[PDB]
Amino acid sequence: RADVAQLTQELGTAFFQQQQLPAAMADTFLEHLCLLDIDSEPVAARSTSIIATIGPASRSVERLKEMIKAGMNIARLNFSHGSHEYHAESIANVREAVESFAGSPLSYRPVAIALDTKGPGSGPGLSEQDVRDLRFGVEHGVDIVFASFVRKASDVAAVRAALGPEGHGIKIISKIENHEGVKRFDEILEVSDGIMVARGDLGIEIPAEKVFLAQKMMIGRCNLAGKPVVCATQMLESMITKPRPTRAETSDVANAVLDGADCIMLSGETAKGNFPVEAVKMQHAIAREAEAAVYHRQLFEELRRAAPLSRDPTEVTAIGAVEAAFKCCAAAIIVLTTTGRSAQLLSRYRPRAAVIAVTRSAQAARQVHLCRGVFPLLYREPPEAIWADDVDRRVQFGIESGKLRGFLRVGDLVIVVTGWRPGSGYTNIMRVLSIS
Amino acid sequence: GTAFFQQQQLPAAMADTFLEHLCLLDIDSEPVAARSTSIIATIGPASRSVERLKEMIKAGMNIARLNFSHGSHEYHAESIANVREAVESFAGSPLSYRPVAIALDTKGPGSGPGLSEQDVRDLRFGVEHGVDIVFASFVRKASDVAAVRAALGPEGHGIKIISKIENHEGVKRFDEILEVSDGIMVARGDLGIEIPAEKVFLAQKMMIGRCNLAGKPVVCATQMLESMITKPRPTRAETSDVANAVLDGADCIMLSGETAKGNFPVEAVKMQHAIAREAEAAVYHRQLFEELRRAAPLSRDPTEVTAIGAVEAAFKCCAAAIIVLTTTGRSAQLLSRYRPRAAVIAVTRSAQAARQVHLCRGVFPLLYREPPEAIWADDVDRRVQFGIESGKLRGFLRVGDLVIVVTGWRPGSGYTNIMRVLSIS
Amino acid sequence: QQQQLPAAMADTFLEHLCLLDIDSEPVAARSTSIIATIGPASRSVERLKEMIKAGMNIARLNFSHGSHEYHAESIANVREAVESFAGSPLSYRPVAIALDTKGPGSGLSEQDVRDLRFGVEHGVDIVFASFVRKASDVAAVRAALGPEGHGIKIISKIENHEGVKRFDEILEVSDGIMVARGDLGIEIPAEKVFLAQKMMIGRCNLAGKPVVCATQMLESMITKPRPTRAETSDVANAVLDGADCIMLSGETAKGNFPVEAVKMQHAIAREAEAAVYHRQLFEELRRAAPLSRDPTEVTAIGAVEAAFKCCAAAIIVLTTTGRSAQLLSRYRPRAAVIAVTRSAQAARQVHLCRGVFPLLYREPPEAIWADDVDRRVQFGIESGKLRGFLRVGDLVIVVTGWRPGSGYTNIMRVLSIS
Amino acid sequence: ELGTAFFQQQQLPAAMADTFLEHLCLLDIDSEPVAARSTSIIATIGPASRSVERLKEMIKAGMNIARLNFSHGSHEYHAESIANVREAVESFAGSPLSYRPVAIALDTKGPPGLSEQDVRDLRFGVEHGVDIVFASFVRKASDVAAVRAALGPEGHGIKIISKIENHEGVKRFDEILEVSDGIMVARGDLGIEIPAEKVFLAQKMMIGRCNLAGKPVVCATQMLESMITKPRPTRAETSDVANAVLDGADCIMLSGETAKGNFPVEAVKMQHAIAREAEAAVYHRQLFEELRRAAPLSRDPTEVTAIGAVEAAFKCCAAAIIVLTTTGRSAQLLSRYRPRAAVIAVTRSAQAARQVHLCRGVFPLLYREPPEAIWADDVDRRVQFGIESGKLRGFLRVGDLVIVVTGWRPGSGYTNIMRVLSIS
Ligand SMILES: O=C1c2ccccc2C(=O)c2cc(S(=O)(=O)N3CCC[C@@H](C(=O)O)C3)c(O)cc21
Ligand SMILES: O=C1c2ccccc2C(=O)c2cc(S(=O)(=O)N3CCC[C@@H](C(=O)O)C3)c(O)cc21
Ligand SMILES: O=C1c2ccccc2C(=O)c2cc(S(=O)(=O)N3CCC[C@@H](C(=O)O)C3)c(O)cc21
Ligand SMILES: O=P(O)(O)OC[C@H]1O[C@](O)(COP(=O)(O)O)[C@@H](O)[C@@H]1O
Ligand SMILES: O=P(O)(O)OC[C@H]1O[C@](O)(COP(=O)(O)O)[C@@H](O)[C@@H]1O
Ligand SMILES: O=P(O)(O)OC[C@H]1O[C@](O)(COP(=O)(O)O)[C@@H](O)[C@@H]1O
Ligand SMILES: O=P(O)(O)OC[C@H]1O[C@](O)(COP(=O)(O)O)[C@@H](O)[C@@H]1O
Ligand SMILES: O=C([O-])C(=O)[O-]
Ligand SMILES: O=C([O-])C(=O)[O-]
Ligand SMILES: O=C([O-])C(=O)[O-]
Ligand SMILES: O=C([O-])C(=O)[O-]
Ligand SMILES: [K+]
Ligand SMILES: [K+]
Ligand SMILES: [K+]
Ligand SMILES: [K+]
Ligand SMILES: [Mg+2]
Ligand SMILES: [Mg+2]
Ligand SMILES: [Mg+2]
Ligand SMILES: [Mg+2]
C-alpha cells in the first residue's frame, strides 16, 4: 500500500481498480493470477497488432474499411494462392480503403502490407516462383515479407538478395514451420527482422503436442532479442463458419499475448471465412484484456536482468524512459523516429504506457505495427527553418493527437524521447511533461 | 548421467528467470514422468460400450463424468455398470489396476433460486449408486453447496463436492464457494455465455490460482478439443488451450462432447494425455514451489508439516516418487498442493479414496487388497513394498532411484507424521 | 575485474559475499561523507588543510564543550583552510559546518537557544540536534533558528528509547537522522544498539533522507596510530548498512592521530562502497519507492536506471537547493552524482547525501539560459576529468530542467565524454 | 493458538518481511530474544581465566570452547589449564539443567613445512585428548595435510580448523577449505598481512564460502578488545560481534579479553548477550532460500533428511529438531541450513558432544544409559531423553511440536528419517 498510497489519493481508487492494476501490484506471479478480475476493465489502447490475410472474403474496399475500423494493422497476401494480378488488385483496394481516412491524423490509421511467400517446396532453396513474387513485392512497395519455411540463415540471405537494392528497407519476418527451423532458430533470428510461429505447418512437421513448446520458446527468445514475433494459424478457426469462437480459441489468443507475441494473425478467418470483420473484432477484444493481465513487475525485472549492458544512447534512453513511465503511470511515451528503431527499443521493455511514434516516413509508420505497443503517427508538415522548432512541432503533434484521441488528458504525465541532432541514430533525451 | 538432465525440460527447469526458462524449452527434450493432470471423460453414446470404456481407461481416462442434464436414471445406472465392468476387468492384475472415479454432473437450478427438485432426486440416485464426486452445476453462493451436501444425506458424507462456476455471481462469490467446496470446476461453456467471451481466460486463471493457493482441486472444462468431435486431429488453438490449462495449474482437464458423442473419444483422451505430459515437464517448478511455500500459512498439523518436508526432500534428491499411505486421500492431497515433480504414489485400501484422489494433480492411486497383517508395522511395510512393485512395473521406478516414503505413527486416518528417504533395490 | 564487479554480478547475496575479492581494487570516488569533530587536536589551519586533503567533508563543532569564542575561532580556521584551495575551481572541495547542540539535559534549553542563534549568526549549514525524542523537539529547534536560519538542515540525534520509539514522527519532520550510539548505548542495553542502528538506517534509506552513523567508530585511534579489527569492521558495516555519513568524535577532537583517523575512514568506506550488492539494493529501493507524479522524482529514477544500463561514470545534475541530487542519491547509483550548483550553502549541505560530489560554479553567467546550462554541464565534465571521475569515451547521464529556478528538473540526457 | 505476544518476540515481525530492506526497517529493540544462544563462544584460557572457580563462572556465562594458545605458556602450564577446565566442567555433572560439555581447542604457534614445535604441540594435543586444533598460518592444502599427519595414529578424529592469517591463505582459500574441517578468520595477523581496510572483505567472503560448504567458521580477534581494561565495550565492539553473527559465523572468539584481561567473565557475558540479539535478527527467509538454491542436489539421505527437517521446523515454528548422532555429522547437516529451531543433538560420544559446539545452533546432550537390547527401544529412549532435557532446560513445553531426525538402522551414516512429534 505505501508504494501506491499518494498516487491512489491523487488518481483515485477507481483508476487503480481498472486495467488489472491490483493484479499488477502483486508481489508474486501466483498472487497476480489470484488478483485477476473480470470486472477490471481495460483502459489502454490495444497494443498487439492484428494481421489479417486478404482474400475473397475481405477483398472489397467497403469490407477493408470495416476491417481497418475493427482493428486490422497489417494486411497479409498469401502468395501460395491467387496470382500477381489478383494480389495487386487486393493491394490497391487496401491502399484505397486506408487512404479514405487520410483527412486528418486525428482519425488517420496506417496499415502495413505484407507478402507471404509460397516457399521452397521439395527444393532446398529460393524457388523461382519466390524470386518472381519477391520482385513483385518490391515493385508494389510492400512493407514486410513473411518468408515461408525458413530453415537456416542462408535462406533469409537468399530472400534479402531477391529483394535487390530497391527492397533494402523491407522487413523480413522468417516463418518457422519445421524441426530444422526450430533447431537453427538462433542463427535465423540473428539475420531476420523478426519471426512468425507458423503453427499450421509446424503442427504437421513436429508432433502437435509440442507446438506450444516451440511457440513459447520462440516468443521468449524474440522478446529477449527485442525483435518482433507473430503468433499465427487457427487462432479463431471455428469463426471461418461460426459468428462466435470456441473457449479454446479465445484462450489461445489471450495466451499468445501473455506469452509475449507482438502480433497475432488471422488466416482463413479473414481470407475465406464468413465473419472476417467479427474475427478482427474478437482478436481486438481479447488482446486488450490479455495486455492488461500481463505481469509487468516480473516481465520488466526479467527483461532488465537479461538484457546486456549497453553503450548505445538510444538503448540507454529507452530503458530510462520506460522506467520513468512506470514510476508515474505515464499515459504515453512520445518518441520521434525516422526508421522506427527508437520506438522498437522502447517496445522491447514492454511499457504499459502507449508508445506514440511520430515519423515522416510512411513506410516506418506502417512497419512499426510489428512492435507491440507502438502507435504510429505520420507527420506530413514540411520542416521548420529552426530544427529545434521542427522537433517541438512533432512532439506537439503527438500531444494534440493523444489529447483528442483518448490517450491523453489534462493532468497526465507523458515521457518524450528525442535526439540531440537530425538524422537516424541520435536519440539520447528523455523529458517528463505534464499535459495542459 | 547427462542424458537424464537433457530430458523432461530439466535445462529449462534450472533457469534463474521465467523468461530464460521459456527460452530453454526444447521440443527434443522428451517427457519421462508419468502424466499427472487427470483426464475427465464425459460418458455418452460414443463411450458407453464396455469394450470402448476399456480402451479409454488404457488411453488415460481417470474420471468418468455422468451428465445428468441428459438421460434418465436407468441410462445413468447402465453407464455406471458399464464403467465398473470395464474398470474391474483389469482387477486380476493388482500391480497395474487403475481406479476410475465416477462423477455425477447435476442438471442445475434452471430459473430457480437454488436446489432443484430434480437435483434432489439425482443426488439421492448418486448416493444410492455410490458415486465418488458431484460436479454441482451453477453454484452461485456458499448456501448452494450446503444444499447439495444436505441432499446427499448422512450416507453421502464422503462424496466430494466440486462446485461449477458458470456465471458472474459464482466468480464474484468465488472465495465463499471455495471455502465450503472440496474443489472447483471452471465450466467455460456457460461462463463464456454469462460473461463476455474475451474475459473467460481471466476467470479461469484467477480460479486456478486461488485453488492452487488453497490446496484444493480445480478442473478446466469445455471445448478443449472441440473440433475432435468430428475431426481426427485438433486445431492449434485446442492443443494450446490444453497445454495452457496445465501450465495455469489445473489439477484436471475435461472432455465433454469429444467423448460423450463424438467420433474420436479414445483419440481425444490420447491427445489430452500427450499434451498434459509435455506441459507438466514445461512447468517452472523453481518459481512455483517457492511461491506455494511462501504463500502457504504456518501449520501445527503434522500431516501438513510432514508433506512440505517430504516435497522439499523430494526436490533435493530428484526423487522418482513420494510413496504415501492414505485412508481418506488427505495425506496425498497435502503432498500434491506443493506441486512436487516426483509422482505421489498413494497406497490405500479404500476403493473410494483411490478413485477420488484422481482430483489431485500428480497423485497415482494404488488400491491395496490384501487383508491386514497382525503386526501393524509389517502391514505398513507390505503396502510400501506394493507401492514400489507397482511403481517398478508401471515405469515410475527403477533400482537405484531415491524415493520419499510418507507414513504415520498409528492406524487410522489423521496420523501421518513420518518422512523417510529410501533407495530402491 | 576492479570495484568488486564479479561480486556485483552475483545472482544471490550469498554468492555476492563468496565473490568478494581483496585484490579487486576500488576505482570509484569515496561516496560516504566523513564528519570530523573539530577540537584542540584539529583546530589549526595547517592541520585542517591536511584533514580536508585526507577526506573531511563536514566539520562538527560540539557545543557540549568549549565556548562561543572558541567555536567561532575553529569555524574561522575551517573557512580559512577551505578557501586556501579556491584558486583552483575545478578541484575546490566545499566543507560543511555543523553545530552539535548540548541538549535538553534534565524541552529546548536556554543554552541551546543561544547556541542555535550563534549558528545562524555564523552561517552554519547543519544542526545536529541532541536528544530528539519527539516531533515537537524538532519544531522547537526550527523556531530557535528563526527566519534567517530557514535553510539550515536539521539532523535529529536519536540517543534514547523514546527517540527510537517515536522515530517515524521525528524522521517525518527532520532533514535527516544521526544514530548517536554513545548515549544510545547507555540509554538502552548496549547489545541492542546494532538493532536501532540498522532499523534507523533502513528507514532513512526508504525515506530518501540522510543518516549518520556516529561514535566510537575508530575509538582506539585517540591514542593508537592503527585501529582495532572491530573498529575497521564497524566502519565498513555502517557503510554496508546504508549510512550516508560516518563520524569521528574524540578521534579528531582530542586524539593524537586526527588526520590518520580521517584517512582510515576514507580507506574503509571506499572498500565497503564497492562491496555494496547494488543488484538487490537498487531493486529493493526501486520497488519500495512510491509511485510519483513529481517530474524530479520521475527523472531521478530514469537517470539512475540509465546509469546502471551503460555503467555511466557519473550523473551530472544541476541543482539550486540540492534536491535533484538528493533524489538521485536515494537510489544509490554506482555512478558518482556530480552536483553543479551556484549556491555555496547547497554545495556544503549536499555532503549529507551519499554519492553526491558538489561542484561550486563560479564562472561568468551566459546571456542565453540554454548556453548557461550547457556551460555548467561542461564545467561538471572538466572538473570530473581533472578529479579522475571521467575519461574520454565514458558515458555520463546529465540531469537538467526545462526552465530556470528550483523544482523544474524533468530532463535526462545520455552524453559521450569528449 | 500461539498468541500475538509470541509473534512480537524474537524479531518475528522482521522475519516475515518480503525484502531485506523491510526486514531491517522492522527490527525492534523491544522484541526480546526467546531462543537459546546458538553461536558458540570460544574463550582463550590464560592467567586471568585459569582457576577452577573462574572457569566455573565462565562456563555459567556461556563459554563453549576453551582455547589454549601454544604461542605462549608451556606444555606443563597448558596441561594444568586443561585439567582445570575439565574439573570445572565436571563440577556440574550432578545437575542435568547445569551440565554442559566444553570443547578443548589447541591453537598452534605456527610455521618450509610444519615447525618442530608444532609437531610436539600437536602430539601433546593428541596425548591430552584435545577436540580441536586451530592451525596457525595455513597458506595451502599441504599445510593442512601436514597438520593431519602430525595428529599421529590416535588423533584422526580431532577437528582441524585452518586459521587464515595472510594473503596466500585468502587466495588459496578454496583448496584450504576443501581439506579442512573449518576455518578461523584470524583478523589480528590478517590485518597486518593485508591492508587493514580489506579485512572485512576477507571475513565476509570466508564466512559466506564456509556457510555454502556447510563447514564451521570462527570470527576471531579484537571483538571486545577494550574489555581487556574496561568493564564495558565500545559501540564498534558490540557492532562487530553482532555483525560477525549476521555475516554467518558459527563461533565467535575472545583472546586477550579472557586470557589476560581484567573482565574475562564480563567479556563472555557480553558476547552471549549480543549473539542472542543478532541471531533473532537473522533474515531466515532469504538465508534459507539462498542456502537451498546454492546447495547442489544430493543423493545422500542425511543431507536430504536434513533439508526436509529444517523446512518442516520452519513450517510449524518447531521448538527444536532432536537428532541422534554418533559423529555429529547429522547435526552439522541440519545446522548448515540455519534453522531457527535449536538442534538438540543426542549422542553417546563425549568427543562428538564437545566438537558439535563448532556448528551454530547445535546443543549437545551426552547420553550414557546402557544400550537397550531392542534397537527401536534404545532409539525411543534417546528421543525421550532429548525431549525431557529440552523441557528441563526451557526449550520445550507440552503441546509444542518438535522434529525428530533418526536413521533406519544403527551405526553412523544412515540418517534418513524425519518425524513430526507433539510433546506430551
Ligand atoms: O490468397 C488467397 C486466395 C486468392 C485467390 C482465390 C482464393 C484465395 C483463398 O481462398 C485463400 C485462402 C487462404 S486460407 O483460407 O488461409 N487457406 C485455405 C486452405 C489452404 C491454406 C494454406 O495455405 O495451407 C490457406 C489464404 O491464406 C489465402 C487465400
Ligand atoms: O569541542 C571540544 C573542545 C572544546 C574546547 C576544549 C576542549 C574540547 C575537547 O576536548 C572536545 C572533546 C570532544 S570528545 O573527545 O569527542 N569527547 C570528550 C569526552 C566527552 C565526550 C562527550 O561529549 O560525551 C566528548 C568533543 O566532542 C568536543 C570537544
Ligand atoms: O596462554 C597464554 C598465557 C600463558 C602463560 C602466561 C601468560 C599467557 C598470556 O598472557 C596469554 C595472552 C594471550 S593474548 O592476550 O591473546 N595475547 C596478547 C599478547 C600476545 C598476543 C599474540 O599472541 O599475538 C595475544 C594469549 O593468546 C594466550 C596467553
Ligand atoms: O529512431 P531513429 O530511426 O534513430 O530516429 C530518431 C531520430 O529522430 C530525431 O529525434 C529527429 O530527427 P529528424 O529531425 O531527422 O526527423 C533525431 O534526433 C533522432 O536521431
Ligand atoms: O491420509 P489419511 O487419511 O490421514 O491417512 C493416513 C493414515 O494412513 C496410515 O499411514 C496407515 O494407517 P492404516 O494402517 O489404518 O491404513 C496411518 O498411520 C495414517 O494416519
Ligand atoms: O535541485 P533543484 O533545487 O530543484 O534545482 C534544479 C534546477 O536547476 C536547473 O537545472 C537550472 O536552474 P538555474 O538555471 O536557475 O540554476 C533548473 O532547470 C532546475 O529546476
Ligand atoms: O550423524 P551420524 O554420525 O551419522 O549418526 C547418525 C546415526 O544415528 C542413528 O540415528 C542412531 O544410531 P545408533 O543407534 O547406532 O546410535 C542412526 O540410525 C544414524 O545413522
Ligand atoms: O504457413 C503458415 O502460415 C502456417 O503453416 O501456419
Ligand atoms: O457445464 C459445463 O461443463 C459448462 O458450462 O462448461
Ligand atoms: O552525542 C553523540 O554523538 C552520542 O551520544 O553518541
Ligand atoms: O592468531 C590469531 O588468532 C590472529 O592472528 O588473529
Ligand atoms: K504461404
Ligand atoms: K450438467
Ligand atoms: K553535543
Ligand atoms: K597461536
Ligand atoms: Mg505454412
Ligand atoms: Mg454448464
Ligand atoms: Mg550524545
Ligand atoms: Mg595470528
Coordinates of C-alpha atoms and ligand atoms in Angstrom, one line a residue, chain D residues 44-45 47 67 69 72-73 77-78 255-256 259-260, ligand 3:
Chain D
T44 CA 41.2 -18.2 25.4
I45 CA 42.4 -19.7 28.8
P47 CA 46.4 -16.2 33.6
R67 CA 41.2 -22.2 23.6
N69 CA 47.3 -20.7 22.7
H72 CA 52.5 -18.7 25.0
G73 CA 52.9 -20.7 28.2
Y77 CA 51.1 -24.7 32.0
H78 CA 48.6 -25.7 29.3
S255 CA 41.6 -13.7 23.1
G256 CA 43.3 -11.1 25.4
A259 CA 43.4 -14.8 28.6
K260 CA 44.9 -11.7 30.4
Ligands
LIG3 O1 48.3 -18.7 27.0 C1 48.6 -17.6 27.4 C2 49.5 -17.3 28.5 C3 50.2 -18.4 29.1 C4 51.1 -18.2 30.1 C5 51.3 -17.0 30.6 C6 50.7 -15.9 30.0 C7 49.8 -16.0 29.0 C8 49.1 -14.9 28.4 O2 49.3 -13.7 28.8 C9 48.3 -15.1 27.2 C10 47.9 -14.0 26.4 C11 47.2 -14.1 25.2 S1 46.6 -12.7 24.4 O3 46.3 -11.7 25.4 O4 45.6 -13.1 23.5 N1 47.9 -12.0 23.6 C12 48.4 -10.7 24.0 C13 49.8 -10.5 23.6 C14 50.3 -11.6 22.6 C15 49.2 -11.8 21.5 C16 49.7 -12.7 20.4 O5 50.0 -13.9 20.6 O6 49.9 -12.1 19.2 C17 47.9 -12.3 22.1 C18 47.0 -15.4 24.7 O7 46.6 -15.6 23.4 C19 47.4 -16.5 25.4 C20 48.1 -16.4 26.7

